[model samples]
Target: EGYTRFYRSPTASVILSGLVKVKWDNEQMTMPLFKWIGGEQAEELHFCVHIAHSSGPKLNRARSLGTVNSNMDQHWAQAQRNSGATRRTIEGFHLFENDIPNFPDYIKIKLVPKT
Candidate 1:
């Protein structure tokens, strides 16, 4: 009953769609449309992780690191949790063109958030 945007590589067009399943409060099923952009530069790929909770030390340190999605994945996860969020996904992803092709060899999960 809503819309969401997830930036991903041409390779993960299917895999992510399979793993990213959410069970919300009411079991109201919803799946995001995985949009594939051709000629995706690999440099934009990033790492993303999920931790336990927000009101903890991990969240504290992540905040001290300035802003989320700035230059790391853990930071972004912290951001998502800090904003009273129950859950968050790869809202957006990108590769800088320098860290491409070699760094991210294959189509991994684009869990990192972007501004």
Candidate 2:
């Protein structure tokens, strides 16, 4: 025995095709620094991600987007559990504004080098 219902809706298919076409056009039209090495109409899959993580100014003078990811304790705990460190103090003492080592600024920067 078999059962089937009849319903026609091509909206989702049309929307997905349109979105993908837009994304393809957006990615293909970009002219980044790598255009010299690769041709103008190259596929995005061939490009490599570049990062300035290795080459950066020292931490002392580097600015920060302060208080970013302020409440990351849960994420840290989950990461620990994933790495098979479940029983190893997964829960930490909750520290808020009124806690020890209450430093004024997260990073002390002396941008101008001393003579």
Candidate 3:
């Protein structure tokens, strides 16, 4: 005999999705270079960087800036976690910032390359 709870949500096999998999060749790199825009008049800002690869996305790391600014730089190892790809050469990256929610009054993402 077997028994199952009647109040169960009756859910099985949930589907998940989000920035899955990054395509890149295995290469060596250094100081890949990461730049972001936005966060003006922001008191606190933070970002979660994700590494995308054939196996899917992995938690690369988290970055926090006490204040927001126009431009910022981030450098990481060529092979972030020996995931068989360089940080700069990774398939792709997903960035999550805490600026939008904190500063509901104003929010924007701008871009400008400096030489």
Candidate 4:
């Protein structure tokens, strides 16, 4: 065993459904959605990984927006594994958006959680 392959065994269960597109950039790519069927606790937990977001209110537009339960990932991860299997498919999904006009939305990236 002497090399890293093109894979990363998902360490947990989580789902992400959202995408972003540049308003000015002529070329862009959409980040697709994903859902890991089953996931277990990782004995080999990572050392570090952090996330943050920024926005340009009046200058540009709302850069991002979303709600966080913080521990929702672990909650879903553990439960996703304990569920009675039947063919893969957990709860449903919905894309977050700034439905209320004037209220900036982060439809560009809304997260439920993922591993």
**C-alpha local distance difference test of each model:** 0.26, 0.17, 0.23, 0.23
lDDT for predicted candidate 1 compared with the true structure: 0.26
lDDT of 2 at 75: 25
Clashing pairs in 1: 42-100, 43-95, 43-96, 43-100, 44-94, 44-95, 44-96
Instruction: List clash counts for every candidate, in order.
Output: 7, 0, 2, 0
**Compared with the true structure, what per-residue lDDT tens digits does model 1 show for residues 1-115?**
1111222332222322232322211222121222222223445432232222224345322211112232332211232233354334322121122234544222122233333
The digit string of per-residue lDDT tens for model 2 on 2-94 reads 111111111111111111100111222211111111123333322111111112455222221111111221221111122232222101111
Residues 17-105, candidate 4, lDDT per residue (tens digit)?
Answer: 21111111112211222323233335322111111222323422222222223333332221222113311221112123345656422
* Residue 89 accuracy (lDDT) in model 3: 29
RMSD of each: 16.7, 23.4, 18.5, 16.0
Error of 4 at 42 (Å): 2.6
Query: Best candidate, lDDT-wise?
Result: 1
- The true-versus-predicted C-alpha distance at residue 29 of model 3, in Å, is 3.8
Reference-based TM-score of each model: 0.18, 0.13, 0.24, 0.18
Question: Which candidate number would show the highest TM-score if scored against the true structure?
Answer: 3
Clash pairs for candidate 3: 22-53, 78-86
Candidates sorted on lDDT, descending: 1, 4, 3, 2
